[PDB]
Every structure is written in C-alpha cells, then in structure tokens.
Coordinates of C-alpha atoms and ligand atoms in Angstrom, one line a residue:
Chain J
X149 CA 146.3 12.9 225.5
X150 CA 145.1 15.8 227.3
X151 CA 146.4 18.2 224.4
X152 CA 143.8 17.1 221.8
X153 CA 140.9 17.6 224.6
X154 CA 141.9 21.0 225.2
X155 CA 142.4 21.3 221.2
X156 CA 138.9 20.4 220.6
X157 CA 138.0 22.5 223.3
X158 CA 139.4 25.4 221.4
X159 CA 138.2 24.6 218.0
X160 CA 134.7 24.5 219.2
X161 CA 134.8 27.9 221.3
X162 CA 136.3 29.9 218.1
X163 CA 133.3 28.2 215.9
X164 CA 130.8 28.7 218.5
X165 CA 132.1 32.6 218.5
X166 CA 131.9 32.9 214.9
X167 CA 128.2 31.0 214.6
X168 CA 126.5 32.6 217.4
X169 CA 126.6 36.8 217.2
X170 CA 125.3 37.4 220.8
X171 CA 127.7 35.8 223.2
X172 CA 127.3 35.2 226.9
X173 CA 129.6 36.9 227.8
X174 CA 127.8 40.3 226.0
X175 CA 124.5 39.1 227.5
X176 CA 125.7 39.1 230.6
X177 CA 127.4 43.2 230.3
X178 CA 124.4 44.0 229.2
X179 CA 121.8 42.4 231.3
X180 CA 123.8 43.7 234.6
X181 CA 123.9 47.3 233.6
X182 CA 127.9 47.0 232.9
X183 CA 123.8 52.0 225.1
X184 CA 121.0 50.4 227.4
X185 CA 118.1 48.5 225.2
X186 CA 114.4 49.4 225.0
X187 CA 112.9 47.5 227.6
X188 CA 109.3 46.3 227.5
X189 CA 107.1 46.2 231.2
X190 CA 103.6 46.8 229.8
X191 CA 101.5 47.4 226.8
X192 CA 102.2 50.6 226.1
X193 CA 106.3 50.2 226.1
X194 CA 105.5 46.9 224.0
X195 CA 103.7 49.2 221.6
X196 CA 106.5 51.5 221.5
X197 CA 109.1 48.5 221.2
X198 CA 108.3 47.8 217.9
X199 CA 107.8 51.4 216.4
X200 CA 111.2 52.0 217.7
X201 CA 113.6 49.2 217.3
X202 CA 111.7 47.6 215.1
X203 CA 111.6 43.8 214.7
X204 CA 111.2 41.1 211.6
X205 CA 110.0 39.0 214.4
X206 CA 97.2 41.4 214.6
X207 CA 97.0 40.5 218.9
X208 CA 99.6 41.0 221.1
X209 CA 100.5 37.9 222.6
X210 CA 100.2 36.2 219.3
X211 CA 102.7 38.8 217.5
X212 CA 105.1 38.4 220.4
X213 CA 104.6 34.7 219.9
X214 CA 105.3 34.7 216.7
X215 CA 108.6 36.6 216.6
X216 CA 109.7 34.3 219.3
X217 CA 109.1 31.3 216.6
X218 CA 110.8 33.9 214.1
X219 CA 114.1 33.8 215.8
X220 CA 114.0 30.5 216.7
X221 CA 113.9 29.9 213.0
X222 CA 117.0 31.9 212.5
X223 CA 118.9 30.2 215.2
X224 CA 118.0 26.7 214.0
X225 CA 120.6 28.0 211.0
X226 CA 123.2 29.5 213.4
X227 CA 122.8 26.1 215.6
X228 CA 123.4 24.1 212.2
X229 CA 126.2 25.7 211.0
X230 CA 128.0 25.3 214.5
X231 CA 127.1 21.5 214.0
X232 CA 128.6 21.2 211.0
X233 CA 132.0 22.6 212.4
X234 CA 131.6 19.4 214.8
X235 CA 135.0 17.2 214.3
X236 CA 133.4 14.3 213.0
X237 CA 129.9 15.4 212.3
X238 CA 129.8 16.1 208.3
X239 CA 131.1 12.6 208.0
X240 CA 128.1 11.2 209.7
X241 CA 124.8 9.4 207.6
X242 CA 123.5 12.6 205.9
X243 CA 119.9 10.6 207.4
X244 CA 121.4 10.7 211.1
X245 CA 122.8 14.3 210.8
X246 CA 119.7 15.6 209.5
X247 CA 117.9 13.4 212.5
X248 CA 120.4 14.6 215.3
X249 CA 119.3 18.5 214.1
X250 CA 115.8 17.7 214.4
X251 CA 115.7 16.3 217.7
X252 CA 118.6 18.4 218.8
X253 CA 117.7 22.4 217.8
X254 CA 115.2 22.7 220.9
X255 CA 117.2 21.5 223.8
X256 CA 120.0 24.1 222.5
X257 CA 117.8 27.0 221.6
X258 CA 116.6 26.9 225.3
X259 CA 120.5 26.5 226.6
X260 CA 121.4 29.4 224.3
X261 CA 117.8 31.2 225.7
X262 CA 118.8 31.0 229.3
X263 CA 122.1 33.1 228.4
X264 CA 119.6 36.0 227.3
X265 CA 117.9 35.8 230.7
X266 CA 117.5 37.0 234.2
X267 CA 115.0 36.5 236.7
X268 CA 113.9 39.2 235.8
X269 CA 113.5 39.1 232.0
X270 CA 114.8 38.5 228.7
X271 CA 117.2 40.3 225.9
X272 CA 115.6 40.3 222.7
X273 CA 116.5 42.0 219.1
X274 CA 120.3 40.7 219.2
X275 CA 120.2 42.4 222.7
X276 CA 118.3 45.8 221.6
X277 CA 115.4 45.1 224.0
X278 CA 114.5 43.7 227.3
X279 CA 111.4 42.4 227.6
X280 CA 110.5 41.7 231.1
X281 CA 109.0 38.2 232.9
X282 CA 106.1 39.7 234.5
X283 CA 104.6 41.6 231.0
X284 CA 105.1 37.7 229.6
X285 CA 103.5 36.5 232.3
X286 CA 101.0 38.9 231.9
X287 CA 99.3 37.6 228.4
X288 CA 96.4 36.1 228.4
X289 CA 96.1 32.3 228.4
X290 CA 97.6 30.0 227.5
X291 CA 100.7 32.3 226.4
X292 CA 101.2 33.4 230.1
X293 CA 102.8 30.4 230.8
X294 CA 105.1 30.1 227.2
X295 CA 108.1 31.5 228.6
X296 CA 107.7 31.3 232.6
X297 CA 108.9 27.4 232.4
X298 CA 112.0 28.8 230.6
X299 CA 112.6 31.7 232.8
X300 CA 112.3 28.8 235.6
X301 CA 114.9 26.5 233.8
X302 CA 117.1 29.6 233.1
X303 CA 117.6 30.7 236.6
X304 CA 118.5 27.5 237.8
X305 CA 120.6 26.9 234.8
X306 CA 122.4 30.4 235.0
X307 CA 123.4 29.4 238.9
X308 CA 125.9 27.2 237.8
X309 CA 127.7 29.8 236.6
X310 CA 129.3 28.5 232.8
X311 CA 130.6 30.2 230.6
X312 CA 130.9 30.8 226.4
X313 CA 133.9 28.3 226.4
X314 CA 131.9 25.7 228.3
X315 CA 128.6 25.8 226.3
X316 CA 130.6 25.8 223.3
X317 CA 131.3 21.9 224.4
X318 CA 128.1 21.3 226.1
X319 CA 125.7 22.5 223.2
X320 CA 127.8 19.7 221.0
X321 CA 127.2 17.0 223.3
X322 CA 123.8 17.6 223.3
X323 CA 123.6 17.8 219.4
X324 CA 125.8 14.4 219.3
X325 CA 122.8 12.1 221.1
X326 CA 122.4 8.8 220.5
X327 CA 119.5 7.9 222.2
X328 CA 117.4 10.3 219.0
X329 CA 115.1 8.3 217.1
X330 CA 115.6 6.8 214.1
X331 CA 119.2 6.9 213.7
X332 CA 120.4 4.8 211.7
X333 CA 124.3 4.4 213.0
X334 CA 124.3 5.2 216.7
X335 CA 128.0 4.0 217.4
X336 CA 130.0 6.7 216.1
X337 CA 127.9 9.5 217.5
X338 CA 128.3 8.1 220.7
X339 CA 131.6 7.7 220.3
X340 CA 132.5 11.4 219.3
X341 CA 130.1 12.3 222.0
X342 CA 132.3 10.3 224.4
X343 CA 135.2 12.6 223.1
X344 CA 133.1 16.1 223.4
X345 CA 132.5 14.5 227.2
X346 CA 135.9 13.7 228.1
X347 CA 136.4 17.5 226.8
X348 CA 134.0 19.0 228.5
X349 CA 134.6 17.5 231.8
X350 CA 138.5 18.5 231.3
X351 CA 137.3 22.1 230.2
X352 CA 135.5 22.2 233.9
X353 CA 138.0 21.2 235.8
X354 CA 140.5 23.6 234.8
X355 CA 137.7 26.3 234.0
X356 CA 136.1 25.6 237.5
X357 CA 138.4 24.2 240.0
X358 CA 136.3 24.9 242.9
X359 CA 132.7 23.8 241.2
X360 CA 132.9 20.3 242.8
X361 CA 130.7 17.8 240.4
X362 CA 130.2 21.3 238.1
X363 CA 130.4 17.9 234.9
X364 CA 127.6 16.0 236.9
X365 CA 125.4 18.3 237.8
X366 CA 125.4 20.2 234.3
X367 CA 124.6 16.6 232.7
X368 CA 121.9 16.5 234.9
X369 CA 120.1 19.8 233.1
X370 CA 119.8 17.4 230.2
X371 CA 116.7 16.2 232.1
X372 CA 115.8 19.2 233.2
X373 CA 115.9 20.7 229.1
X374 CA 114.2 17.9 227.8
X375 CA 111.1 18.2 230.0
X376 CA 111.2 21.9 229.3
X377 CA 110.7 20.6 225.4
X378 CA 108.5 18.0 225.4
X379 CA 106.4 20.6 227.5
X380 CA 106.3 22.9 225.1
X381 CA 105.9 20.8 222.3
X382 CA 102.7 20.5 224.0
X383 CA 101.8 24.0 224.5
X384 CA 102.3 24.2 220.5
X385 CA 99.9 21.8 220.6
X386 CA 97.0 23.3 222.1
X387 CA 97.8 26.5 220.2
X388 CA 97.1 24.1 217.1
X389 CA 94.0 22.7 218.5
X390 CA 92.5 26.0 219.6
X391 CA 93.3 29.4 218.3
X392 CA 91.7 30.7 214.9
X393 CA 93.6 34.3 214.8
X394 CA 97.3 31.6 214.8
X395 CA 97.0 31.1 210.9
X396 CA 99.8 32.8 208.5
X397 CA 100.1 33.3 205.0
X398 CA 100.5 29.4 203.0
X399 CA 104.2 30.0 202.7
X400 CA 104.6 31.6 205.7
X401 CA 103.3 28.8 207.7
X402 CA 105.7 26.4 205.5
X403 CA 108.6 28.0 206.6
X404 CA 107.4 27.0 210.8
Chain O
X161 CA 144.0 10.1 248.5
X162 CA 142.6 10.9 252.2
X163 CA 139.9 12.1 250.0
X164 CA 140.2 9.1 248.1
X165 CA 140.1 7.1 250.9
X166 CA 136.9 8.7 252.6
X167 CA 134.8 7.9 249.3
X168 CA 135.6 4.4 249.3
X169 CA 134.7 4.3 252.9
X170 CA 131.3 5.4 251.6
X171 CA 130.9 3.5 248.8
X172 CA 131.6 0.3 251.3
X173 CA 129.3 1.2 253.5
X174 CA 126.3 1.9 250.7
X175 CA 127.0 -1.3 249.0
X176 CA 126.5 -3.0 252.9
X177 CA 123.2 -0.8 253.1
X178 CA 122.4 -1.4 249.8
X179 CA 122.5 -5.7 250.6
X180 CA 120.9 -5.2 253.8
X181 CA 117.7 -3.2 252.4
X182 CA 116.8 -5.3 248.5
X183 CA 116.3 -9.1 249.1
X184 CA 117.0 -9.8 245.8
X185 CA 120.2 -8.7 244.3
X186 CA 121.3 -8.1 240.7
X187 CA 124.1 -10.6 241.2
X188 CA 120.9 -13.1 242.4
X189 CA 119.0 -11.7 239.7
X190 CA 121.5 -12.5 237.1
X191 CA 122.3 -15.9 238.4
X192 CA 118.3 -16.7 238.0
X193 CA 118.0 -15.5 234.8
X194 CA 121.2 -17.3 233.0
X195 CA 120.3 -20.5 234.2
X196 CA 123.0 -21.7 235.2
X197 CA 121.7 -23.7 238.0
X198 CA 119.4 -26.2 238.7
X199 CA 118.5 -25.2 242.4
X200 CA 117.6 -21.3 241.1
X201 CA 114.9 -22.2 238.0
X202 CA 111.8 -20.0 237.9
X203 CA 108.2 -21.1 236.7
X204 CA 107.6 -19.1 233.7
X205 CA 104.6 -18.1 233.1
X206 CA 103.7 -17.2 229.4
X207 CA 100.4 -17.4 228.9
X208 CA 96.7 -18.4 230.4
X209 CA 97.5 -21.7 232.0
X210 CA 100.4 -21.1 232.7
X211 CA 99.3 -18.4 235.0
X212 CA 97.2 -20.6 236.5
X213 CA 99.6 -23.0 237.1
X214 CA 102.2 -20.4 238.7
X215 CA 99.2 -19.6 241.4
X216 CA 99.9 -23.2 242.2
X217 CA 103.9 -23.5 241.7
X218 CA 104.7 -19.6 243.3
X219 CA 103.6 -18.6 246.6
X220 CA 102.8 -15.2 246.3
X221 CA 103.4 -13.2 249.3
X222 CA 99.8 -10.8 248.7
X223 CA 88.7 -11.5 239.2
X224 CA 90.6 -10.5 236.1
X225 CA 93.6 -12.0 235.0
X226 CA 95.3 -8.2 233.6
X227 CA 94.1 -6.9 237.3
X228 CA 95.5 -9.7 239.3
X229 CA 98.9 -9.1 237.8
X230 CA 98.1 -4.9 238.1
X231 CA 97.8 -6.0 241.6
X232 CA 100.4 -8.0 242.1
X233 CA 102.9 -5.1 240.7
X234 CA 101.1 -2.6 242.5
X235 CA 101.8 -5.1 245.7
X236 CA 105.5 -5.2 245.0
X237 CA 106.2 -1.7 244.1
X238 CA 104.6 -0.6 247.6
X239 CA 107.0 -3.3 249.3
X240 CA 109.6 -1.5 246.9
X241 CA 108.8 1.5 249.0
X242 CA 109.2 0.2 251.9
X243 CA 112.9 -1.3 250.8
X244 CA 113.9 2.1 249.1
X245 CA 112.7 3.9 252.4
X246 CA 115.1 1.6 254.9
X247 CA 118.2 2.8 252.3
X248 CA 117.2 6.1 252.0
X249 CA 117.5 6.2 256.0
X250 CA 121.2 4.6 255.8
X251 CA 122.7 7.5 253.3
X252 CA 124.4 9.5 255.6
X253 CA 122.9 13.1 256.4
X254 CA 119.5 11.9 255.0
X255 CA 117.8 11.4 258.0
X256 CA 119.3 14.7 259.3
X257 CA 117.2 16.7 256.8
X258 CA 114.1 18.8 257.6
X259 CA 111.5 15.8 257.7
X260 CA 109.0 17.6 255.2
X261 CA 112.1 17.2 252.7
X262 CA 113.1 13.4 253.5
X263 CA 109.4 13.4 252.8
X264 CA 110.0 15.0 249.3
X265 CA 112.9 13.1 248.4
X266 CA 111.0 9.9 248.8
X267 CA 107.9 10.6 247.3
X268 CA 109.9 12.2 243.8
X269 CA 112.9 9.6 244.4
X270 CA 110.9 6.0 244.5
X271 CA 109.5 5.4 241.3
X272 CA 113.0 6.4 239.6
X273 CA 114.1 3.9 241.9
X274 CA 111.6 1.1 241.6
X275 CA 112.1 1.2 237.6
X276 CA 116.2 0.9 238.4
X277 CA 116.0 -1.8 240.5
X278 CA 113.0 -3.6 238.0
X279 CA 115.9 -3.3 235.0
X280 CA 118.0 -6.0 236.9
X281 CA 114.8 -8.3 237.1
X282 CA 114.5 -7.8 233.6
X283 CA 116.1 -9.6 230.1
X284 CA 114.8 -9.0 226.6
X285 CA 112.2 -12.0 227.0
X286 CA 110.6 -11.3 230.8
X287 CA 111.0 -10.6 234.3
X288 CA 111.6 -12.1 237.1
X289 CA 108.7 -12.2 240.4
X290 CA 107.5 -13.2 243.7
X291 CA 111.6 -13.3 244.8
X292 CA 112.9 -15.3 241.7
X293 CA 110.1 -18.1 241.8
X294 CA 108.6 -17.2 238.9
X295 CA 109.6 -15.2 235.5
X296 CA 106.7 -13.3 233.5
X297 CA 107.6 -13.2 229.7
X298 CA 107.5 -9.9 228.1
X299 CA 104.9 -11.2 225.0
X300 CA 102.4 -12.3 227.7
X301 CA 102.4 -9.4 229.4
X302 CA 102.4 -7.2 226.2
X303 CA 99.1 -9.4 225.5
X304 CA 97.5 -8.3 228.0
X305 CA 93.6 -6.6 227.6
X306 CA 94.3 -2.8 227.1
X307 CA 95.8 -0.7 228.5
X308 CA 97.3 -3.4 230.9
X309 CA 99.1 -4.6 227.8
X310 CA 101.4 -1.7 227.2
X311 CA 102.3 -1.1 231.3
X312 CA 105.3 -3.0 231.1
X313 CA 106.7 -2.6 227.5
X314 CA 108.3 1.1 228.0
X315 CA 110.1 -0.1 231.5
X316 CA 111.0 -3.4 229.6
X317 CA 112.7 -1.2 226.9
X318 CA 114.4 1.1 229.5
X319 CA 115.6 -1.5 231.2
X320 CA 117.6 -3.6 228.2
X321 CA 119.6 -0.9 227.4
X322 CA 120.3 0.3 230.9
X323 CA 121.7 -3.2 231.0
X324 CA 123.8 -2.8 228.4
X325 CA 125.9 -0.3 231.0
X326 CA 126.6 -4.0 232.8
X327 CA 126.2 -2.0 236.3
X328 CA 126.8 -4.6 239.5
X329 CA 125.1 -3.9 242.7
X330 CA 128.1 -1.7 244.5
X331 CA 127.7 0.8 241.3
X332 CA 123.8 0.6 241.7
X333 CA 123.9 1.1 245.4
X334 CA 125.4 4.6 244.9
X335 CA 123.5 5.6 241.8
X336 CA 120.2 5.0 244.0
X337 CA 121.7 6.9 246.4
X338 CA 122.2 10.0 244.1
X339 CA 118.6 9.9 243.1
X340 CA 117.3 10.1 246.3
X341 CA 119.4 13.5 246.9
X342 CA 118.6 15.7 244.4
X343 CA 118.0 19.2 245.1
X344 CA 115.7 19.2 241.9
X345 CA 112.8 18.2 243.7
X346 CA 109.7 20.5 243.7
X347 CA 108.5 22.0 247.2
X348 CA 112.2 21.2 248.5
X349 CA 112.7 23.9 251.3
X350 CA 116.2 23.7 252.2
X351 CA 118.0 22.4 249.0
X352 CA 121.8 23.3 249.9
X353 CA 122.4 20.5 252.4
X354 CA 120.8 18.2 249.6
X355 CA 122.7 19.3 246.8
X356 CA 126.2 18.9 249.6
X357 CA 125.2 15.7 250.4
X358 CA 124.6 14.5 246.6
X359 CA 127.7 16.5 245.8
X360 CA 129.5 13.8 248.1
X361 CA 127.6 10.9 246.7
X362 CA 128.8 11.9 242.9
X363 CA 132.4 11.9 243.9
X364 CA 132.0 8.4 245.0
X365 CA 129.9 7.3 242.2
X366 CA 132.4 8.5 239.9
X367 CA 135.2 7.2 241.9
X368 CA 133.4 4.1 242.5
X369 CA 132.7 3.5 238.9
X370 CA 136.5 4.2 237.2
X371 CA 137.7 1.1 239.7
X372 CA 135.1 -0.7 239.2
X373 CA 135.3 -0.7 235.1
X374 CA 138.1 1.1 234.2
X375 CA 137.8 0.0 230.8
X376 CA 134.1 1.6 230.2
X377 CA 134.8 5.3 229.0
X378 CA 132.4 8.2 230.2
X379 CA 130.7 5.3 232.3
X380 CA 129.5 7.9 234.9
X381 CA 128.5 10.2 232.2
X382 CA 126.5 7.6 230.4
X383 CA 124.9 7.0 233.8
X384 CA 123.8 10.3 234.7
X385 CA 122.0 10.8 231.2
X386 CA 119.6 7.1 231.9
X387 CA 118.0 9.8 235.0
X388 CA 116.8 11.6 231.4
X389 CA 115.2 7.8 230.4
X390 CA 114.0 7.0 233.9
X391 CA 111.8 10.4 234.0
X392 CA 110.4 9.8 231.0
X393 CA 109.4 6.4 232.0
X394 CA 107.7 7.4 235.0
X395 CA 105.6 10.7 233.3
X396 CA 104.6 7.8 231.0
X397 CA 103.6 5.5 233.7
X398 CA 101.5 8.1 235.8
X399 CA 99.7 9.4 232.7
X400 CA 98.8 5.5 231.7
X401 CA 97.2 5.1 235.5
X402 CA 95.2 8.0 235.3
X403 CA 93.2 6.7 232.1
X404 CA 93.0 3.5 234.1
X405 CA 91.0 5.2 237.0
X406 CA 88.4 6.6 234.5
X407 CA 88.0 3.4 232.7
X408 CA 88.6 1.1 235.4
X409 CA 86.3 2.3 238.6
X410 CA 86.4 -0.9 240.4
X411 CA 89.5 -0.9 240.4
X412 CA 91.7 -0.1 244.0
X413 CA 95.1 2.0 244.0
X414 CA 96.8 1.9 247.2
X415 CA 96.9 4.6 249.4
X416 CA 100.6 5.2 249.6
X417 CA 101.0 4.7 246.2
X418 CA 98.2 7.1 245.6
X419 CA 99.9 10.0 247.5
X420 CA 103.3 9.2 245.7
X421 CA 100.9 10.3 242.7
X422 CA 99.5 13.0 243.9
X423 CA 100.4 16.4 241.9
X424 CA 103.8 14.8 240.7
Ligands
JJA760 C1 118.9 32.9 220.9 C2 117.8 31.9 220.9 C3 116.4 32.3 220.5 O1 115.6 33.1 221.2 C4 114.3 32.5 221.5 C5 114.1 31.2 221.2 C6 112.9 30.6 221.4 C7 111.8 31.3 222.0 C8 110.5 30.6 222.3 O2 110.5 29.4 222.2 N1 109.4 31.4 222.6 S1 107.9 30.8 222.8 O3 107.9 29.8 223.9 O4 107.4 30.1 221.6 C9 106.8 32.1 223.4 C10 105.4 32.1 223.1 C11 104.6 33.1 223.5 C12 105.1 34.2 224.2 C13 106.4 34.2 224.6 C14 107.3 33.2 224.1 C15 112.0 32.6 222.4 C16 113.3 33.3 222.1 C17 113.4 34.7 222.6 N2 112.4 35.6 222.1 C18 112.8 36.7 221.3 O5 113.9 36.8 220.9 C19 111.7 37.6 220.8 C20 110.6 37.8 221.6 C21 109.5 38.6 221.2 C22 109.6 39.3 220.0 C23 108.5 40.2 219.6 N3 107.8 40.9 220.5 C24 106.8 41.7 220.1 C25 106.5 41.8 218.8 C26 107.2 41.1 217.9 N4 108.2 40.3 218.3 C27 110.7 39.1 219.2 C28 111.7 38.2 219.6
JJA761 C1 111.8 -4.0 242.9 C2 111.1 -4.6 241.7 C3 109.8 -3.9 241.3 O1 108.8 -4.6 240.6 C4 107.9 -3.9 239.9 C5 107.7 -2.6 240.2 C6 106.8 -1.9 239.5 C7 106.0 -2.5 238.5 C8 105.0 -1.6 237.8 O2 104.9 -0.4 238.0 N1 104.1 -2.4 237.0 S1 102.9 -1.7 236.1 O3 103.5 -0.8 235.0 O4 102.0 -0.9 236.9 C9 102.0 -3.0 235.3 C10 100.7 -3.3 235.7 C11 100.1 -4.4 235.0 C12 100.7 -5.1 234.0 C13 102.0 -4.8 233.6 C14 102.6 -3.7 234.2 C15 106.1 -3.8 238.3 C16 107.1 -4.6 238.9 C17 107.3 -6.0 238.6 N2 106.1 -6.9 238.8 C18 106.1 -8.0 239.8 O5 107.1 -8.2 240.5 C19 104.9 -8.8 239.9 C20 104.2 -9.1 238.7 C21 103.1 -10.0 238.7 C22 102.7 -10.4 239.9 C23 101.4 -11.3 239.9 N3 101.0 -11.8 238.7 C24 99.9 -12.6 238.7 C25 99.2 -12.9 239.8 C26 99.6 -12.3 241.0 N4 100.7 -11.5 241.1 C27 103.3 -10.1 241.1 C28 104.4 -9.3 241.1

C-alpha cells in the first residue's frame, strides 16, 4: 500500500516542479552564495533596483507594497494550477474548489515565501534581487512591520530543514482543508487530505530518518501560518482605513 | 520495541497524573451527560428561575445574573489553573526547566488547556458545572445581556467537533501534555530542552493514539491541527474581555487570570 503513497508523492513533486518556476532548491544556491542578484539595503540601491532589473511589480513603501501584492497575484495562478493537478481535486463541488482556493492561496504563498528567505532578506524578481530585512523594516509605518512577521515565521519555518519534494505534499494538504467555510461537501476533502497525510508523513520518514516528529512538528506550522494570515489580513485592513496615496486605476484595483 | 516499551511507560504514567490532577473526568463527564443513571442527574438550568433554583439545588463551591455566571467561570477557570499547574509539574523534565520558562509554558499553555478540558463538559445543548451538579444549556447562556451572550458560543462550537475525534482521557492526558511543551512560546529562553521533551511526548501521543483507535486514520494528525482551533478560540476570548473592561468598570478580573492576560 506503501507504493501508491510514494506514487502520489511523485506525481505531486513533478507538478509542483512544473507549476512553480523558482524552486527551493535554486533559492537556496542562490541565497547562500553557491550571476549574483541586485540586492537592495537602502534607498538609493532600491532606486537603482528598478532602473536596472526592472520589475512589473508614486512613494516608496507603497510601490514596494504594491509589487509584493503584484506577485502574489501571479502566484495565486501558479498555486491554482498545482491545485488542479491534485488527485481528486477537479472532481470536487466546482463551489468547494473555488472556496478551498480562497481560503487556501495565503497560507501557501507565505510557505512558498519562506523558501525565498533568509534572516537576512528576501529573493525577489524570480530570484534577480535581494532585498534585505532591515531596508523592509526600515519603511515608515505601518509597512515596517508587513514583512518582519514573515521573516519571523520563515526562519523558524526554514529550521526544519524540508525540502521541494516535501512542500510539494505539504502545500496540498493545506489546500485540501476542511475546516474552510462554506464548503459545501467536507467528507471527501478530508478524506483525500487523509491520503496527502499519510503521504507526507511516509515522504518524511524516508526523506528524514533522523528528524524525529519532523510530521508533527511541521503540522504544527499550520498554526503558526494561519496567525501569520489573519494578521495580515489585518494590516490590509488599516491600509484600507487609512492611506489616501493606496488608490489604483478602477481596473487595476479590480484585479486586487 | 524497548522504545516502544518506554512510551507506554509514559503514557501510563500521564494518564495516572492526568486522574490524580482533574476531579472530573471525561469518562465522568460522559456518564453525566448520557443519562444513563439515576444517581449522576444534573439540575439544568435553562433559564431565569431556573437559575434561581440551581443556587438552591447546586452548592457552588465560590448582582447581575450575566456577571454571576462571568464569575462563576472566571472562579473555575482559575481552579482550572491550579489543576493544569499540579500536571504540568508531573510531566517529566518540566519541573527541571529554567523556572522563568515553566513560568511561560503555563501562562501560554492554560487557556489552550482549560478550553480542552471544557469540550468534555460540553454536548450540542450545554455544559456541565459546579462538578456535575448542574448543566447550563447552551440557549440560556447564548441569551445572555451582551456581550456575556456570545462568551460561550465559539468554545461551545470548538468543542462539538473536537468531540467528534471521540478522545478518552489516556489520549487527552498526553495531548495536554504536548501543549504545555511547546517551544513556540514567546519570551522562551532555553527552547531545545522543551522542544526534546515534547519531542518525547509526540512519540507517545502518536503511539498512544494507533492502540488506542486503530481504526481512526490520521487520528494524531487530525489532533495536532484542533491546536489551529484552540488558538483561535482563545485570541477570540481575550479580545471579547478587553471590551468587557471598558464597558464593564465594576466589574473584577482576577489577578492571576489577569497576568495570564497580560501581553499574550
Ligand atoms: C513566491 C510567492 C510570492 O512572493 C511574495 C508574496 C507575498 C508577499 C506579501 O504578502 N507582501 S506584503 O506583506 O503585502 C508587503 C507590504 C509592504 C512591504 C513589504 C511587503 C511578498 C512576496 C515577495 N515580494 C516580492 O516578490 C516583491 C517585493 C518587492 C517588489 C518591488 N519593490 C520595489 C518596487 C517595485 N516592486 C517586487 C516584488
Ligand atoms: C475545566 C473546566 C472549565 O470550565 C470553564 C472554563 C472557562 C470558562 C470561560 O472562559 N467562560 S467565559 O467565556 O469567560 C463566559 C463568561 C460568561 C458567560 C459565558 C461564558 C467557562 C468554564 C465553564 N463554566 C463553569 O464551570 C461555570 C459556569 C457557571 C457558574 C455559575 N453560574 C451561575 C452562578 C454561579 N456560578 C459556575 C461555573
């Protein structure tokens, strides 16, 4: 029975390959020093930054905002097409797929985020630049404090040491949740969950042999990512409430 | 199977902890609320007069009727504390720990704990009180005056489909125990020997739980995911208290409770 785990297992690390360009496992070369990227400590190298390398991503903090929400967009795509390749998934209510995305996009793009990070900063523009954690905690309030929770989460995260093969099965048990609300037919996405659980906790074991609880205490992140979400949610928030110079063009604002 | 053998021996000896600590089991619990028995019936108290009338029918062992039942929780979860603090002390290691960390553990760990324990006092209808005696339905108390009436409904909520996992009171001894160890906990100074020590506590857990229901797949992962729930439950809660200060000045916390509160 242990040959469809590790089949399953498979399938989802070729999809999650094909779906998301900038692996760990490239992040990681990079990061470490092992063709380096344009990195960004102050103002100046910021300014610099974007005349060089360019990105699609009129202040400072608010244009580094923005791209942020810019890529986010474009991995909410990359995150739904891995979804899709979900055993199981596509034949879900189209309601409760839809619903499972929703809920689901943020928890992952922060996973996939902490692969992009050290303590000391983060790779951005498909790995072109570096920008660094003290210039992002360096903008003014409240956008001081956007990414520093991340970088927190990240470092922590990153200790446990997983690799591309094992987020490939972790990032689709988070999408298969069945606690989201509003779904409409919880049983069989908690029972293809189940299965993505019984894979992942196989793929540590052989993965990690050593990691003792490595399962547990990467289940226990959960908690950790979904009060990294909910907090930002309410960052967003108070960006809404306050801040006049936030507003985009009509359909540029639809698109976030 | 040595190792085997040595997580069993822990679970054992939780589980004995675990009795010796909580007055009031889950097996107790359960018996209470299936009514069964004749010897076990509660009072129930589901509205006005029938509050009244439990004063007279329960002994409680500690104005407004929302704030004499705030009270009375407040009263139990601060016994609660005091239960949850005589375990904590029987895990082994715990009391070995730098004491400004025991310190941390508890003060992080209790509510977490207070809201798991509730959820076996607690049906779809009420909860049980005051050791059994009595049982507090779950429309009175969402009828309460604001915002006493919406206290209870989120742990009520929690707490059926925790329930659902049909834990017994040897799984729950060792859950508790996890969520006292964990190296999560802000202002921790030495988290390694916390992070062993609940390394040691998951193995038996997870042991613990494929003996105990072999048939329930991913048990132990469905477990660890309800710490998600039991956060949430408590941000909730603290948030709900502090509007209660502002609008409620008369009203008293108590003190230990208070520094439990204090910057979590
Ligand atoms: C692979 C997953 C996606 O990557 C993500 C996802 C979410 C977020 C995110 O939630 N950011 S954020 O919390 O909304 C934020 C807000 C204000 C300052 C910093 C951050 C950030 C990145 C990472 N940030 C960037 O890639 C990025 C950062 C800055 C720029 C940029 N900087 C200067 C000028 C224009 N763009 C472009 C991209
Ligand atoms: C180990 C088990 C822990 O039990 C706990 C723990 C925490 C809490 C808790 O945090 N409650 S609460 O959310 O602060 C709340 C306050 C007011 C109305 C509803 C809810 C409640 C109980 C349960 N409540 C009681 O046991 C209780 C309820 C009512 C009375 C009471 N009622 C009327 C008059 C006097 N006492 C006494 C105890």
């Amino acid at each position: 029975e242990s040959a469809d785990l590790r089949a399953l297992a498979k399938h989802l690390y070729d999809s999650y390959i094909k779906s998301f360009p900038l692996t760990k496992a490239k992040a990681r070369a990079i990061l470490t020093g092992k063709k380096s990227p344009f990195v960004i400590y102050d103002m100046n190298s910021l300014m610099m930054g974007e005349d060089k390398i360019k990105f699609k991503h009129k202040e400072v903090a608010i244009r580094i905002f923005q791209g942020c929400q810019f890529r986010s967009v474009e991995a909410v795509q990359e995150i739904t097409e891995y979804a899709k390749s979900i055993p199981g998934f596509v034949n879900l209510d189209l309601n409760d797929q839809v619903t499972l995305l929703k809920y689901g996009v943020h928890e992952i793009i922060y996973t996939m985020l902490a692969s992009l990070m050290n303590k000391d900063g983060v790779l951005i523009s498909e790995g072109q630049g570096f920008m660094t954690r003290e210039f992002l905690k360096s903008l003014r309030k409240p956008f001081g404090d956007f990414m520093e929770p991340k970088f927190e989460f990240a470092v922590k995260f990153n200790a446990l040491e997983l690799d591309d093969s094992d987020l490939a099965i972790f990032i689709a048990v988070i999408i298969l949740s069945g606690d989201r609300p509003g779904l409409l037919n919880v049983k069989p996405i908690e029972d293809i969950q189940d299965n993505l659980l019984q894979a992942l906790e196989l793929q540590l074991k052989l993965n990690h042999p050593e990691s003792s609880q490595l399962f547990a205490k990467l289940l226990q992140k959960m908690t950790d990512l979904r009060q990294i979400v909910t907090e930002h949610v309410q960052l967003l928030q108070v960006i809404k409430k306050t801040e006049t110079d936030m507003s985009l063009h009509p359909l540029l604002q639809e698109i976030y």
